[PDB]
Design a protein around this ligand. Structure first.
Ligand code: CA
Ligand code: CA
Ligand code: CA
Ligand code: CA
Ligand code: CA
Ligand code: CA
Ligand code: CA
Length: 280
């Protein structure tokens, strides 16, 4: 639960960097100085950028309640799994966490959360759903390592969402519902790139890959596509048509044995996908 106050800052938050930061905001000259609940109530923001903090370090904030802090500044840290800070930040409205090496942004109860900047983090396959943050107006996840497949129906639980930035990620699918609903006055999905796991096939067979983006793109346009092998163009086929599956076949039957890096380059929404292949 919490640490009873009054108490010294170092007892309330036993992480050097965090206690020095709190001491600085309250203008106390030492982490040994005593703070009251009234002192924590004067903080409208939590300035913790660029301090080498991990998720564990930050979890210490839950030892108290900053009843009026409306902003959390944690950019340029080394977080990993971000803890659930709703206990400590009940009035939170804005999260500025650019390039903080966050790998997981958990579902957390932040009623007043309006804006979140999670750009340049590194989620990998941990796509966040923002459960508990139904009031969000703008989300920025530009160049944040978002990877894999995402459902057509995610992010349909935020009635005021007006800006969703997702360019420069590694998604192989499109969140169709939200882009087609027309709520968003600002949106970006450009440059999605991904290198699929490597696989093996026999000399003569031709590779079938799972790429939903190729087909979903059609719900946003109406036609180019290029197929390359180890960086050189192999053929430029006509854009396919959707009829029930997201599998795309690439003509590798004529290729000789050895290592081959196949690439599907799309352009007009845009991107490229690599498929490392070993032909026997
Ligand atoms: Ca120090
Ligand atoms: Ca100061
Ligand atoms: Ca003092
Ligand atoms: Ca930008
Ligand atoms: Ca709108
Ligand atoms: Ca569809
Ligand atoms: Ca077909």
């Amino acid at each position: 639960d919490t640490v009873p106050l009054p108490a010294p800052i170092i007892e309330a938050f036993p992480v050097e960097a965090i206690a020095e930061a709190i001491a600085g905001e309250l203008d106390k000259d030492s982490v040994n100085d005593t703070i009251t609940q009234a002192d924590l109530d004067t903080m409208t923001a939590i300035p913790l950028p660029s301090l080498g903090l991990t998720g564990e370090d930050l979890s210490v904030l839950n030892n108290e309640v900053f009843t009026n802090a409306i902003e959390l500044a944690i950019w340029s840290n080394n977080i990993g799994e971000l803890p659930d800070l709703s206990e400590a930040l009940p009035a939170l409205e804005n999260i500025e966490a650019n390039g903080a090496n966050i790998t997981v942004f958990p579902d957390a109860n932040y009623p007043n959360l309006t804006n979140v900047d999670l750009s340049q983090n590194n989620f990998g396959f941990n796509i966040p759903k923002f459960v508990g943050m139904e009031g969000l107006v703008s989300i920025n996840m530009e160049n944040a390592g978002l990877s894999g497949y995402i459902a057509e129906d995610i992010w349909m639980n935020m009635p005021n969402l007006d800006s969703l930035i997702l360019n420069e990620n590694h998604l192989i699918s499109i969140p169709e519902d939200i882009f087609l609903s027309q709520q968003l006055g600002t949106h970006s999905f450009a440059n999605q790139t991904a290198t699929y796991p490597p696989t093996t096939i026999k000399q003569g067979e031709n590779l079938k890959v799972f790429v939903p983006f190729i087909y979903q793109a059609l719900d946003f346009i109406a036609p180019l596509i290029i197929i390359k092998d180890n960086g050189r163009t192999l053929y430029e086929p006509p854009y396919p048509t959707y009829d029930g599956s997201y599998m795309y076949t690439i003509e590798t039957a004529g290729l000789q044995p050895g290592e081959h890096l196949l690439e599907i380059s799309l352009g007009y929404y845009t991107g490229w996908y690599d498929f490392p292949v070993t032909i026997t």
